[PDB]
Every structure is written in C-alpha cells, then in structure tokens.
Write a protein that holds these residues in place. Structure first.
Motif, PDB file in Angstrom:
ATOM      1  N   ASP A 155       0.838  -1.187   0.000  1.00 11.62           N
ATOM      2  CA  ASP A 155       0.000   0.000   0.000  1.00 11.62           C
ATOM      3  C   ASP A 155       0.882   1.249   0.000  1.00 11.62           C
ATOM      4  OD1 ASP A 155      -2.707   1.276   0.270  1.00 11.62           O
ATOM      5  OD2 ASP A 155      -1.842   1.967   2.174  1.00 11.62           O
ATOM      6  N   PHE A 181      -0.488   5.045   0.595  1.00 10.50           N
ATOM      7  CA  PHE A 181      -0.878   6.018   1.609  1.00 10.50           C
ATOM      8  C   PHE A 181      -0.933   5.374   2.993  1.00 10.50           C
ATOM      9  CE2 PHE A 181      -2.110   9.833  -0.746  1.00 10.50           C
ATOM     10  CZ  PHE A 181      -2.086   9.358  -2.039  1.00 10.50           C
ATOM     11  N   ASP A 200      -2.149  -0.995   5.711  1.00 17.26           N
ATOM     12  CA  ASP A 200      -2.754  -0.448   6.915  1.00 17.26           C
ATOM     13  C   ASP A 200      -4.246  -0.716   6.996  1.00 17.26           C
ATOM     14  OD1 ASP A 200      -2.845   1.750   4.753  1.00 17.26           O
ATOM     15  OD2 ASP A 200      -4.207   2.565   6.278  1.00 17.26           O
TER      16      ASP A 200
HETATM   17 MG   LIG Z   1      -3.287   3.040   3.181  1.00 14.56          MG
END
Ligand SMILES: [Mg+2]
Lengths: 377, 75, 645
Positions: free
Chosen positions: C382, C384, C569
């Motif tokens: 990922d 961000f 996340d």
């Molecule tokens: Mg993310």
C-alpha cells in the motif's frame, strides 16, 4: 417534513433555471403535481419571470414509443421491462405480449405458470421479437408525438423538473422529443439526484451531490389524486392522457401543508438564500434518511398507502412466516421503520432470526412520541 | 516488558511456542493455524510495527509475533 | 513394499480411481496404495459400496501417518489445498480430468467465474504446482495446449494413456456388474446407447426437457429396436424437477434407464455401442475406451456457431428431437471410419500408441527425478499510510487547507462551497463512486474506480462553477496532497531491502488521484520509490477493496512466486480481501490521534482547524518519537508528553 423535503429543492431548481436562461419549466406526470404546485406558489410570492407547464406521461406510456429505430438493450437489463416479476401475470405484462401470443413464440415459457436473467437472454436472442416490438412502438408513437408537438413549445429555451430516477426515462423522452420535433432537441432534466452522466441530448442538473437514494420519497408522490398515466387517447381531434382519478383528501392536505410551508420558508430572514436552501436540504434529507424511529416518519410517512402501507409494523407470526430477505421485502419497504414501529417482542424475535435468515441487522430503538403524547381524546 | 530494537533486522529466540498473526491487532481471525514458531527456536525480525496504543509487534517473514519479554528474547 | 501412493479427489471417480484400483490389484507387492477422501462420510460410503480397506480421509490419523512420508499423490486437478504435513519431496501425479481444445486454469483469466479460486489456488500452492506436479499428457497437441494453459514444468511431464479409459476393459477391473443395474443383461439389448449432454447456460426449460421432450416416443423407438437408452445428464441438470419426474415415470422401464451416478460410468464404457454426445470432453474418453458409433446431437449448434468442432469431433449431426428419433429408429449409423479414428486418436492420444501400459506409466512416474528450483517471492505495498503519510495526519486536513486557500485567494466562490467544502467534496466523491457502481451496464464494464477529474466534473456541472474556480480547487487539492507528503522511511527501506534480496516488489494502491500525481508524491517521499511497479486503482479501474486489483495483479504478472506477502494499513483492502485470495498479509495500524489531540482538532472552526491539525500532528510525532524512537519508559514518556502538550 414534506416542506423541508420538497420546497427548498424546487426553490433551488427555479432559481437555477432562471440563472441558466430557461423560459419554461415542465413538470412530468405524478411526481410533478406537488412540485408544480410548490413552484407556482414560489413564483407567485417572489414574482419570478418564468412559466410553468404540466406534462402527462410515465415509463409505460413513453418507453415503448421511444423505440424509434431500435429496441434499447436496457430493456433486457437488470432495470429493463422484465425486472420485478413476482408472478406469471407479471412476466406476461413485462413481455408486452399476451399470454397466448407470447407462449406462441416461447413454448418453453409455458412452465413456471437466474430465471429472470435467462428470460432476458431468450428475449434478447429473437430478431423477430425486436422487429415486432419496433413496429408496435412506431405505431404507438403517433399519439405520443402529437401530444408532445401540441404540449411543448420547441422554439423556447425550456427545461424539465423531476425528483428522482436513474435517468433512462429522461433519455427515452428526449428521443421522443427529437422524433416529434425533427431536430436535436436539448432536454435538461432537474433531479434531486441521478446516477448517470449526460447522454445524447439529455442534460442533468442535480440538486444534492451525495450518495443518497431518494426513492424513499415515492410514497408521498403516490398520493397524487390519479393513477400513473397508462397511455393517451384522442377526442375533439386533440390528444389527452387517460386519467383515472383517486381520492383527493390526502393530496389536499399535503398541498395545504406544502403551500403553508412555502409561505413560511420564503419569509425567513436569510443571509444567503441559496446557502440556506442547500443547508436545510442537507440536514432534512440526512435526518429523514437516517431516523427510522422518528415520531412522524413512523406514524405518518410509513403509514401512507402505496393499497398497502409503505413500511407497516410487523407481527410476531409474520416474522415466523419468513425465512429470507425476499419474503420480508414483500411485507415492508423499510425494515428499520417497520421494526421501529413493532412491539419489543417482535424486535427480539427479529434479532433471534436475523443471524440465521441473513436479514439486515436492526440497529435502532422503538419509536417514542415527542409531541401530543398519549391519546389526546 | 516488550522486546524490540530500532535497528532491524535482529534475531530473537522464542521462549515459548509462539503463534503467527497477519495483523498487528492479533485478532483471532489473523492468527495463522498452518504453522507456528517452535519453542527454543530463533527467527529474524525484519520490522517493528506499533499498534495505535503503545504495544510493539515483531514482524517475521511468516507474520507478526509478540514482543512480550516472557515469550521472546533478543539474541 | 517400497513405494507409497495416495489418491485423492472430490469424488470416487476419474484417473485417480482407475489407477488406484489397477494398482491395488496388479501392484500389491511393489506399492502400498491408499485413497484419501475429503471427509469421513466419503470414506464410509466408498467402503460400504466397494468393500476396500485401503481408504482413509483427509486429516485422518491414517492420513497423518501416510502423507508425511508418502511417495506419490495422485490427483485429477490442481487441488485448491494440500495437506500441510504433505512430504516435501512428494510427487504430485496430476492425471487430468479430460482432454480437449478448450482453455483451462490460468487461461480462464480474470473474467472467469472461477477467477478468485484460481488466484487463491496458485498463490497458495505455486511451489507445489511448479516443482512437484507431474502432469499427464496424452498427445503432443494436448501437451502443448496444457503447457500453454497451465504452469507445469516441461521436464516433469508424464506421457501415456488415461487410466480411466484403459483399465475397465472386458477382462479388466470392475467394482460392479453392469447387468445388475440394467433391466436385462447387456447381451439382452440389440445395442446400448449412452446419452451424455452438457449443462447449457441459458435454460428457460430444463436442459433435459429441451433435448428429450417426449420420453414416451423415445421409449417406443427403443423398444422397436430393442435398444437400451442410458441417460447420464450433467450433474447440475439432475437438480431440475423434470429430471426427477421423468426418472420416476420410467423408474422400471425395459429400455430407458437413468444411470445411477453412484456408479462410475467409465467402468461401463466397454459395454457402450452408441454414444449420443454434444460438446463434452467425455467423447474423447469414449473414443479411447473403444466406442465407435457416435451421434452429435447438437440442437444448439446455432449458438456455438458464428465463431474446429467439425474436424475434431465424430458423430452424425442431429439438431432436432424428431431427427434424433428418426436416427434411433432408422438404425443407419456406421462405425467411425478407420482413417477418421486414426486421425482423432493421433491428434488427441498420440502418446498412447507408443505401446504405453499402466505399469509403464507407473514406472515413468516412479523413475522420475524432481529437480526443483527455488522461487522468488512477491511483495506488494500500500502507498498512503504505508510507504508515505501526511504531515497533518488526517486526510481531511488536505481539504481544510484547500478551502482555506480558496477563501483566501480572492476568487469569489459560492458560500455553500467555501463554508461547507469538507462535506461538499467528500460527498461529491462518494456520489461519483455510487454513480460508477450503478452504471456498470451503461458502461459495459465491471471497473468502478473514480478519478479526481470525475469528482470535480460532477461539482462543476451541478454547481455551475466557472473553469477558473474548478481548476483552482483541483490544482489546490493536488498541490496540497503533494506538499504534505512525508516518507515512512522504515517501510520504504524494508521494501528496497526485499528488492535487494532478489524478490519482486510492487505497490498496489486504491486512489482517485492521477498516476502522475501519485508518482510526484512518491518522488517527494523517496526518489527510489519511482522505480517500483505501480498498480494504481484510478489508472486500472480495479480496487483492493473488491479484490479485483489483486486478481489483475495475478493475471498481469508472470506469476512464478513461491509466496505473496502484502503490507498495508487497511484491515479490509490490505488484509481481509487479500487473505481471501490466499495472500499472506502484514497489516499495521494507521496513525491516529488520542483523546486530547482529537478533542483539540474537533473543537476548531474553519479559522483554526488546520493549525489545530498541525499542532495535534506535532504532539503525535512527539509521543511517537518518545515511545518508539527513544524507547523511554511509561513514566518518562508521560511526563515529557504532558509537559509538552
Ligand atoms: Mg493506506
């Protein structure tokens, strides 16, 4: 409630049309009754320079005639004509063809007197069916074209004001406009919201830019004092819509309230009327869409006949007779409201059965009246 | 009570039989059940990822393990 | 006993069953053979129906004993799961479930109804597939086709015959007497016909009712000729009510027999004189079993047309039920021509004619040598809040900033837009998303990802904004997103360490920003990141949340990896969903405020919200450094954070 739901929207739409240069605003059948009443009251009070007209029509009266040179593939999609069938009568009615005339072409269809997908496919695979539908449509289009030509002034800069929809009906009506006036006629529709981009001559001005579903308000519009326009007819050499009336009590009171609210609402001391329209609309739509245990959404809205209620209370045995969400949707159009209206034992039974039957989770509490509590008699 | 280092990677010895989790949350659904860290075995820790609170988790090529000093020990 | 073979499949069927029986008979001294069923009840059924004792089930104590030190595992599919205690060096003898000219396995692509299952299978068990699967091929054409459609090692190929088509012959193996199932003895018909239709998709009326409407006329025409008509429809076809109705109406008929699927029909192939087939692979099996009279009953040849079936299938063509009746009564169906049978048998089972035997197959397998290769891993990241973060932490901070710039630029904006920019923009984004989701038909595409341009087009067209206003707002948001970038250095350095270890790494992100804006952000976080492959949802149209982006990655890469790990996340996009696709996940926690910081930020109006974001993020950075950089204890950290904040 209904004023907050309708009047700010119509105000925004009227002001936006005056801004965009529209000379005439047309309100389409059923949904447009109350909205045109509101717009007329607003224009009277504020003295706006814009005409309003009323046009009769519907999906049934406009879809078939809109097939000018081809039958839309949308007809065979998830939101086509063969969508929503519950019984064999529903299938025969969606087919456009009689039971006998249809079973003549599809003997396999004699049974059942996934399934919808295969039915749509078999319908899509017959070119003869396509050409016959096209002929029927070109024949039914005479009256619709004449009605359009007689009711809509094409030399003006005009627009149409609706409430909610995907936008496909607007596309068919714009096709009918082009066929009736013989040119590329820009038709702009005003919605509260729609799920589709501008396509062809259809332009779409949307009030609220948020992922809200306003089918919620269909019951209110269903109080208009006449049924959905099935088709047209001719007399005095003029085309007229078939209007089968209903009782006027509900619509009478609704219009009374809507006009009172319009008067009160245009009198408010606002610093910026557009901003207040937007803010009140945002608040009111959010509230009514996420408050299933509200006193008046429970006791008034959900009790409106659509003749059966929209989302009535549920009984213990009614839930004992269900095993799926399909069976429950036949019982109510809003599980949250129906549960917020049902007895605590019914709610507990729903909780007991939901985890197994795979029903939506009930995350509200019973409705508690706030004003005029207890029997006033 | 937490074993970790700002300098990764670093070897650790498994004091007890340690399970692997595919999420710092250590939720039951993320605990691996196909394999585990055998008691008294060593393993490299290639990252240290912290919960929203203040508890560290030691990432290995097979998933997260605890940092609690009763279960792992820096080599 | 030197070698040990287990045999597995979801049913008592196929080349696994054929070879298992043939070895339990003709190889009792050189091999120990067991059949592992999927559960206990399957074993119980097999043992009751066949009386064998070498039947165990998965995770049985007998299976836990055998698998750790077995020699061969025979299968008819690339199984979805293999026992975790399965021996490291086992030989997966994959005796496929049929031959033909249809695409299979990796060739089915992302549009297949089995896409998720294929991605899971391969991501999970690619090591086994590539280093331990000996795939059985019957001809050069079929070997090439299968090697094109699958990920098998050309060196581990096994050439020979299909055990299920060469083992249940006249003098061969039989677990049941065919005459005990028929109304009369097999010699008690003038001939036997086997009807093997295929499950057709669009079926208004049951597939069987459309093919064989009137069973009375069929039975009459069979009596007139003294034929035994044996109906074995597709598995799903047996669920229709017409199937059971016609089975009950002729439960005791002397000529129409609905084959009881509890018995393997292949064992009876040698007793079949005529075969009525359409588009199923079983035809070739029949051709390999000795059958020689074929009727291609293809009423639905109109569909498969307009797209060679003619050259690679035998059997007189019959498209109407009346034609089928006239053919069954007329009795004018000759044996397949010698030249045509030679043609098809070469083309499809050429490696058969190499004087191949069952024991020859077992020898080729046993005498095989596994020369495995160590495979590289795949690591997706990922973007961000995994490789980069925002200097104000919360995403909406960006919007705050943008609003503050709009209101400060001097360009007049509508009050509703300025004062309410957060809600305006976030709700416009979700509106565009719902539009995409609801217009999959209108677009004839399942991709539903939006772009920043869509959001601002919606806003401009429905708020009647000037090009100046819209471009100002969009460029402000882009430039702000770029200017608030910060690296998450530890994960970036770990990603590049992985790459330096020889693994393949890539980034898979769900975001509406254009690809070039994403690359500018990455470049501001760490220049190295610019060189890593990128799967941006806005560019591709598929998202991790739906799992479609993972499928796109699987089918886009030349998947050759021993393991797939995804670092993220999001407990769903980077955890739940990828795990459903058989991907190992490492899911960390996103940065977030704590009570005091949150209350501070939530307490501000438009004038004071962005600096409140700045200060709360500074507090978060401070307590982060104290706890997870300097390694202070609870009391010291608490003292410092209090004294500061
Ligand atoms: Mg993310």
């Amino acid at each position: 409630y209904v004023g907050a739901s309708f009047v700010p929207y119509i105000n925004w739409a009227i002001k936006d049309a005056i801004k965009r240069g529209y000379e005439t605003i047309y309100f389409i059948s059923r949904d447009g009754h109350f909205l045109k009443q509101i717009a007329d009251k607003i224009i009277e009070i504020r003295g706006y320079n814009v005409k309003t007209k009323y046009i009769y029509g519907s999906r049934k009266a406009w879809r078939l005639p809109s097939f000018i040179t081809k039958v839309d593939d949308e007809t065979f999609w998830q939101f086509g004509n063969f969508v929503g069938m519950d019984s064999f009568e529903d299938l025969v009615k969606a087919s456009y063809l009689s039971e006998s005339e249809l079973l003549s072409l599809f003997p396999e269809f004699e049974s059942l007197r996934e399934i919808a997908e295969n039915i749509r496919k078999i319908f899509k695979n017959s070119p003869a069916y396509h050409e016959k539908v096209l002929a029927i449509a070109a024949e039914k289009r005479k009256m619709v074209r004449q009605y359009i030509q007689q009711e809509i002034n094409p030399k003006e800069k005009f627009a149409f004001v609706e409430f909610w929809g995907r936008g496909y009906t607007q596309d068919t009506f714009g096709r009918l406009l082009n066929d009736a006036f013989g040119k590329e006629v820009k038709n702009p529709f005003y919605y509260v919201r729609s799920f589709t981009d501008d396509m062809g001559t259809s332009v779409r001005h949307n009030f609220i830019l948020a992922p809200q579903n306003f089918s919620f308000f269909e019951p209110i519009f269903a109080q208009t004092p006449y049924d959905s326009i099935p088709d047209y007819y001719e007399e005095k050499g003029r085309i007229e819509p078939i209007i089968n009336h209903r009782d006027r009590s509900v619509s009478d009171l609704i219009s009374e309230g809507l006009l009172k609210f319009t008067e009160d609402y245009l009198a408010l001391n606002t610093q910026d009327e557009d901003y207040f329209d937007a803010a009140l609309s945002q608040f009111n739509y959010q509230y009514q869409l996420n408050t299933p245990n509200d006193q008046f959404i429970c006791n008034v809205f959900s009790e409106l006949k659509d003749e059966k209620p929209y989302a009535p209370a549920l009984t213990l045995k009614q839930l004992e007779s269900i095993t799926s969400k399909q069976e429950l949707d036949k019982l109510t159009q809003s599980i949250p409201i129906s549960l917020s209206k049902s007895d605590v034992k019914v709610i507990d039974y729903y909780n007991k059965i939901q985890k197994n039957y795979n029903l939506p989770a009930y995350n509200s509490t019973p409705m508690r009246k706030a004003y005029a509590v207890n029997p006033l008699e | 009570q937490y074993v970790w280092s700002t300098q990764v990677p670093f070897r650790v010895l498994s004091l007890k039989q340690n399970s692997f989790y595919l999420d710092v949350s250590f939720a039951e659904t993320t605990k691996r059940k196909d394999i585990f860290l055998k008691e008294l075995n060593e393993i490299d820790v290639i990252a240290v990822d912290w919960l929203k609170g203040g508890v560290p988790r030691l990432l290995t090529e097979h998933g997260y393990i605890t940092a609690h000093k009763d279960w792992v020990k820096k080599s | 006993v030197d070698k040990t073979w287990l045999f597995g499949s979801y049913a008592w069927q196929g080349n696994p069953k054929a070879l298992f029986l043939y070895m339990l008979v003709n190889c009792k001294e050189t091999h120990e053979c067991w059949w592992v069923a999927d559960n206990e009840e399957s074993m119980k059924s097999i043992k009751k129906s066949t009386g064998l004792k070498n039947i165990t089930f998965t995770d049985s104590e007998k299976a836990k004993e055998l698998f750790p030190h077995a020699d061969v595992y025979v299968t008819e599919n690339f199984r979805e799961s293999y026992p975790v205690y399965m021996n490291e060096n086992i030989k997966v003898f994959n005796t496929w479930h049929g031959v033909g000219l249809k695409h299979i396995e990796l060739a089915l692509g992302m549009n297949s109804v089995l896409a998720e299952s294929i991605v899971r299978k391969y991501v999970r068990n690619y090591d086994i597939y590539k280093n331990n699967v000996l795939f059985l091929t019957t001809s050069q054409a079929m070997e090439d086709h299968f090697l094109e459609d699958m990920a098998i090692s050309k060196e581990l190929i096994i050439r020979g015959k299909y055990p299920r088509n060469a083992v249940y012959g006249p003098n061969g193996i039989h677990t049941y007497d065919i005459n005990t199932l028929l109304p009369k003895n097999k010699s008690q018909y003038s001939q036997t016909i086997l009807f093997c239709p295929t499950y057709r998709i669009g079926a208004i009326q049951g597939v069987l009712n459309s093919l064989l409407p009137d069973f009375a006329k069929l039975e009459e025409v069979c009596r007139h000729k003294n034929q035994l008509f044996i109906v074995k429809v597709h598995p799903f076809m047996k669920k229709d009510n017409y199937f059971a109705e016609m089975s009950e109406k002729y439960k005791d008929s002397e000529y129409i027999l609905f084959w009881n699927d509890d018995y393997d029909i292949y064992e009876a192939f040698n007793s079949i004189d005529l075969a009525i087939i359409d588009y199923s692979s079983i035809f070739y099996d029949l051709l390999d079993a000795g059958v020689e009279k074929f009727i291609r009953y293809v009423p639905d040849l109109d569909e498969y047309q307009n797209d060679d079936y003619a050259d690679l299938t035998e059997g007189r063509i019959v498209k109407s039920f009346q034609q089928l009746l006239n053919c069954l009564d007329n009795a004018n169906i000759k044996i397949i021509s010698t030249k045509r049978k030679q043609y098809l048998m070469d083309y499809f089972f050429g490696f058969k004619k190499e004087n191949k035997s069952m024991e020859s197959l077992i020898a080729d397998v046993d005498n095989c040598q596994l020369q495995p290769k160590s495979l590289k891993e795949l690591h997706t990241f990922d973007i961000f809040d995994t490789l980069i973060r925002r200097s104000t932490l919360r995403p909406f901070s960006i919007f705050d900033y943008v609003r503050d710039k709009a209101k400060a630029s001097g360009i007049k904006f509508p009050l509703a837009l300025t004062e309410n920019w957060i809600n305006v923009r976030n709700r416009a984004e979700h509106d565009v998303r719902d539009i995409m989701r609801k217009t999959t038909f209108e677009r004839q595409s399942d991709k539903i990802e939006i772009t920043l341009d869509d959001i601002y087009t919606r806003l401009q067209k429905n708020l009647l904004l000037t090009d100046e206003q819209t471009d100002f707002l969009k460029q402000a948001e882009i430039e702000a997103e770029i200017a608030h970038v910060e690296p998450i250095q530890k994960r970036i350095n770990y990603l590049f360490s992985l790459k330096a270890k020889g693994h393949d790494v890539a980034m898979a992100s769900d975001m509406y920003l254009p690809e070039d804006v994403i690359y500018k952000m990455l470049d501001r976080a760490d220049t190295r990141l610019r060189e890593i492959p990128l799967y941006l949802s806005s560019t591709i149209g598929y998202q991790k949340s739906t799992g479609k982006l993972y499928q796109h990655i699987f089918f886009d890469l030349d998947y050759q990896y021993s393991r797939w790990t995804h670092y993220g996340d999001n407990k769903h996009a980077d955890g739940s969903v990828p795990r459903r696709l058989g991907i190992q996940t490492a899911v960390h926690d996103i940065d977030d405020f704590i009570p005091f910081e949150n209350a501070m930020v939530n307490a501000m109006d438009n004038y004071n919200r962005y600096p409140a974001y700045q200060l709360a993020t500074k507090m978060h950075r401070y307590r982060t450094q104290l706890v997870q950089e300097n390694g202070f204890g609870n009391t010291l950290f608490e003292t410092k954070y209090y004294n500061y904040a």
